[PDB]
Amino acid sequence: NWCDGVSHCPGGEDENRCVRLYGPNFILQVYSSQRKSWHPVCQDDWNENYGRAACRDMGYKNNFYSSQGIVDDSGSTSFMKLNVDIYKKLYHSDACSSKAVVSLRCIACGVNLIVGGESALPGAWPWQVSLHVQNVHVCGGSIITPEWIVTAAHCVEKPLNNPWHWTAFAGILRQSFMFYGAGYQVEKVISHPNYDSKTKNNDIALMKLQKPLTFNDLVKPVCLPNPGMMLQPEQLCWISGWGATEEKGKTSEVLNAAKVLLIETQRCNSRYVYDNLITPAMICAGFLQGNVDSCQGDAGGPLVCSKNNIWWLIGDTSWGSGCAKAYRPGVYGNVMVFTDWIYRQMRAD
Amino acid sequence: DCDIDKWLNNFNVPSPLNWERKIFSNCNFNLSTLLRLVHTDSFSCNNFDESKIYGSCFKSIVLDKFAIPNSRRSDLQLGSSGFLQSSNYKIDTTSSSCQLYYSLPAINVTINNYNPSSWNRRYGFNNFNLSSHSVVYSRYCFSVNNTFCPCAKPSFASSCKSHKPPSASCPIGTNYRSCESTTVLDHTDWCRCSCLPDPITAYDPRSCSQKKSLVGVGEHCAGFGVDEEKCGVLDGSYNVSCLCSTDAFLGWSYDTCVSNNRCNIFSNFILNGGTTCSND
Ligand SMILES: *[C@@H]1O[C@H](CO)[C@@H](O[C@@H]2O[C@H](CO)[C@@H](O)[C@H](O)[C@H]2NC(C)=O)[C@H](O)[C@H]1NC(C)=O
Ligand SMILES: *[C@@H]1O[C@H](CO)[C@@H](O)[C@H](O)[C@H]1NC(C)=O
Ligand SMILES: *[C@@H]1O[C@H](CO)[C@@H](O)[C@H](O)[C@H]1NC(C)=O
Ligand SMILES: *[C@@H]1O[C@H](CO)[C@@H](O)[C@H](O)[C@H]1NC(C)=O
């Protein structure tokens, strides 16, 4: 009674999300109401036309990159075969002739060439966006699709909740070259409906451009995380932005980047770091010794991790205490959690 | 008449934490007798020929003795880096020395467990509440400056709303525990202090005033690390002295020296250079 094709729901929250990609290999899975679980789609009688159908229903509109078959690595026993919405064209089977599982990529992403870091090179972080208000850097963001940018919700609180205040600059490393009209205009700003301004819970927001970005050698998307990333307890990740290079400093002229490690929530919630302040929707990153971390002006900036040769968007700069201080790691929004919300908004457009 | 064997057979035997040294000079000795008056398990020499002891003369012979924990005899193998040879007594490798392993009857032997660290005693360390034949050894050693004090300033602590530290008065000449008041969202007087959670597993060793160190040749353990969250009292004042509780002292443990009803004892013989002749 989740994806049976029956609307019976005032918001349509269930029907809107029945198709997903799984793990680092973008395995296509569909939710079945009969068994109340996700099952991989097999490649027998599967083609690009079906792949495109699945992308559009996943909020990627008319974007499509590739579709091919892989050997299963999700550890599934039951697979769905192709016989309405794409998820309604599938039925359960024990074993499919092709024995190959559909791997679907709806967009080309995750490919490239702050305190305690160093100046970024051209093409090093193609997804970086500088978000200006009154032609002054306020926050950053990350490119996910040509017209969609991920940022933080605390950045866009009233009266900055009005889209016409914001312009986005991409492909530019230096603030001095972010000229008055060289950026893109934001048409709408959407903040998470359960955002808590006192605890900064669910601190995520999306911005949509009225003029889609043109992707090239310098400007590219970063991949949204799939369910089942299975990252290491101490994953090697990168942060970047135009924030201050020192506590109580001023905005940096050029994009800087630094390498950080992820920190387990179990440790962050201890009394000696952030006594029970870190929710499932939050990720810690940085070092417990300080030295390397984000700072003022990096809000909304991406936290990206490399796995399977792909750069994934794991989090976004949200809050912290001090600036690169001991026992006080930066805290990022957990994008892996908000991924379903993001798809619902990209699709409902 | 050096009388080394009487010193070795003295039933007041130190733990590795406070090993004792004695210097024998201007006297005669006989190794054959020495190794018969003590129940020797093993005797070997390092960078020195054992057979050359007989008939030779030395400027002086220096002996360092202590009880051996059952579980850590192997820690006394030269070149090892466990606990006994790195936090208690380091064995030299460049000097001519001989290592004597021997034992005394447990029924007579009494272990002297004493903490030689002045900064531990200064701030409330007393004695070891241990049973007979318990041998105390250090696992981690910490050194501090002459300005060290584990308690927060009463004036500082009085202003804390979250994570308020223990506080007390400190000895004249020392500094108070380093703490600061921060804000973590709507939390405004969130007090952040050093050596957390403790000096052994501290997340940031650079912020802590207690530095780890290893013992070199001829010196004892710098001292036990202190849990600064147990020193002084919560909501304290200048009317109370900065004293630590017994379970504030970390980085030490103990075992028994008992095999076949005997206590195993280590004695390192250092041959220096004389008149100290082995006319055996
Ligand atoms: C593939 O889809 C077709 C859709 O027509 C299924 O055929 C229908 O099956 C239902 C029973 O579930 C019958 O009541 C309809 O009358 C059938 N329609 C026709 C035209 O025969 C077909 O069973 C599906 N195949 C599988 C394996 O599920
Ligand atoms: C050792 O203890 C036994 C107890 O029976 C006693 O008879 C003996 O004299 C003691 N020897 C020494 C040197 O204390
Ligand atoms: C050990 O603790 C007991 C109390 O349980 C006390 O009576 C005894 O004297 C203590 N021993 C030493 C050596 O402090
Ligand atoms: C201890 O004293 C040394 C100087 O000998 C100084 O460099 C060091 O910073 C001091 N440490 C503390 C915690 O005061």
Which atom of ligand 1 lies nearest, measured to the CA of A83? 1
Residues on chain A touching B207 (C-beta within 8 angstroms)? 326-327
- Largest separation between any pair of C-alpha atoms in chain B: 82
- The data reach a resolution, in angstroms, of 2.9
Question: In a 10 Å sphere around its CB, with 0-12 CB exposed, 13-18 middle and 19+ buried, how is residue A326 labelled?
Answer: buried
Using CA atoms, how far apart are residues A282 and A278, in angstroms rounded to an integer? 6
Please report, to the nearest 10 degrees, the dihedral formed by the alpha carbons of residues A280, A282, A288, A290 taken in order: -170
Structure tokens at B58: 């030395």
Structure tokens at A61: 């509109």
Which atom of ligand 2 lies nearest, measured to the CA of B107? 2
- State whether residue A248 sits within 8 Å of chain B by CB: no
Same domain, B128 and B15: yes
Rounded to 5 degrees, what angle do the CA atoms B267, B270, B273 make?
160
Structure tokens at A177: 């070259």
The radius of gyration of chain B's CA atoms, rounded to the nearest angstrom, is: 23
- State whether residue A291 sits within 8 Å of chain B by CB: no
Same domain, B12 and B108: yes
* CB atoms inside a 10 Å sphere around CB A261: 17
* CB atoms inside a 10 Å sphere around CB A163: 17
Same domain, B23 and B114: yes
Same domain, B56 and B184: no
For ligand 4, which residues put their CB under 6 angstroms from it?
Answer: B 145, 209
Same domain, B135 and B272: yes
Distance from CA of A292 to the nearest CA of B (A): 13
Q: B204 lies in a domain?
A: yes
DSSP classification of residue A57: I
- Which is nearest to A127 in space by CA: A208, A207, A220, A217? A220
Q: B196 lies in a domain?
A: yes
| Residue B171: domain span | 145-215+225-250
B131-168 core/surface letters (b: 16 or more CB in 10 A; e: else): eebbbbbbbbbbebeeebbbbbbbebbeebebbbbbbb
A170 and A129 Cβ atoms separated by less than 8 Å:
yes
Same domain, B124 and B165: no
Q: B220 lies in a domain?
A: no
In whole angstroms, how far apart are CA A227 and each of A1, A19, A88, A206, A333?
Answer: 22, 12, 22, 20, 16
Q: Is A271 left (phi over 0), alpha (psi -120 to 50) or beta?
A: alpha
* CB atoms inside a 10 Å sphere around CB A264: 13
Using CA atoms, how far apart are residues A50 and B47, in angstroms rounded to an integer? 80
Residue B6 Cβ contacting ligand 2 at under 6 Å: no
Ligand nearest to the CA of B108: 2
DSSP classification of residue B135: E
B256 and B42 Cβ atoms separated by less than 8 Å:
no
Ligand nearest to the CA of B111: 3
DSSP classification of residue B6: H
Residues 202-221 in B contacting A (C-alpha not used; CB under 8 Å): 203-204, 206-207
DSSP classification of residue A29: E
Same domain, B71 and B112: yes
Q: B61 lies in a domain?
A: yes
Residue B129 Cβ contacting ligand 3 at under 6 Å: yes
Same domain, B236 and B132: no
Structure-determination approach: cryo-EM
Using CA atoms, how far apart are residues A335 and A203, in angstroms rounded to an integer? 10
B232 and B151 Cβ atoms separated by less than 8 Å:
yes
Q: B91 lies in a domain?
A: yes
- Which is nearest to A200 in space by CA: A239, A237, A152, A162? A152
Domain count, chain B: 2
A301 and A239 Cβ atoms separated by less than 8 Å:
yes
Same domain, B125 and B177: no
Which residue has the least CA distance to atom 3 on ligand 3?
B129
Same domain, B113 and B155: no
DSSP classification of residue B76: G
User: What beta strand segments (E) does chain B contain?
Assistant: 12-14, 20-24, 39-46, 57-58, 60-67, 97-105, 110-112, 134-138, 141-143, 166-167, 179-182, 190-193, 211-213, 225-226, 233-234, 249-250, 252-256, 262-272, 276-277
Which residues lie below 8 Å from residue A259, measured CB to CB, with a gap of 6+? Answer: A117, A236, A237, A238, A292
Domains and CATH numbers, chain A: 19-105 (3.10.250.10), 109-225+232-349 (2.40.10.10)
Same domain, B118 and B231: no
Peptide bond into B116 cis (omega under 30): no
CB contact under 8 A, B192 and A327: yes
Q: B100 lies in a domain?
A: yes
Using CA atoms, how far apart are residues A299 and A138, in angstroms rounded to an integer? 8
Which atom of ligand 1 lies nearest, measured to the CA of A81? 27
Ligand nearest to the CA of B145: 4
* CB atoms inside a 10 Å sphere around CB A210: 11
Residues on chain A touching B184 (C-beta within 8 angstroms)? 274, 277, 321, 328
Q: B264 lies in a domain?
A: yes
A269 and A278 Cβ atoms separated by less than 8 Å:
yes
Rounded to 5 degrees, what angle do the CA atoms A59, A64, A67 make?
115
Mutate to test the interface with A, among B181, B193, B203 (most CBs of A within 10 A): B203
Please report, to the nearest 10 degrees, the dihedral formed by the alpha carbons of residues A102, A104, A110, A113 taken in order: 80
Ligand 1 mean position to B27 CA, how many Å? 110
Distance from CA of B206 to the nearest CA of A (A): 8
Using CA atoms, how far apart are residues A36 and B96, in angstroms rounded to an integer? 77
Beta bridge partners of B101: B42, B266
B219-240 core/surface letters (b: 16 or more CB in 10 A; e: else): ebbbbbbbbbbbbbbeebeeee
- State whether residue B188 sits within 8 Å of chain A by CB: no
Using CA atoms, how far apart are residues A182 and A130, in angstroms rounded to an integer? 12
Using CA atoms, how far apart are residues B143 and A153, in angstroms rounded to an integer? 48
- Which is nearest to A303 in space by CA: A238, A249, A216, A245? A238
Let me know how long chain B is: 280
Which residue has the least CA distance to atom 4 on ligand 3?
B129
Structure tokens at A205: 């927001």
Which residue has the least CA distance to atom 7 on ligand 2?
B108
Same domain, B153 and B230: yes
User: What beta strand segments (E) does A54-204 contain?
Assistant: 66-70, 79-82, 90-93, 101-105, 118-119, 128-133, 136-145, 148-151, 166-170, 184-191
The CATH number of residue B268's host domain is 3.30.70.1840
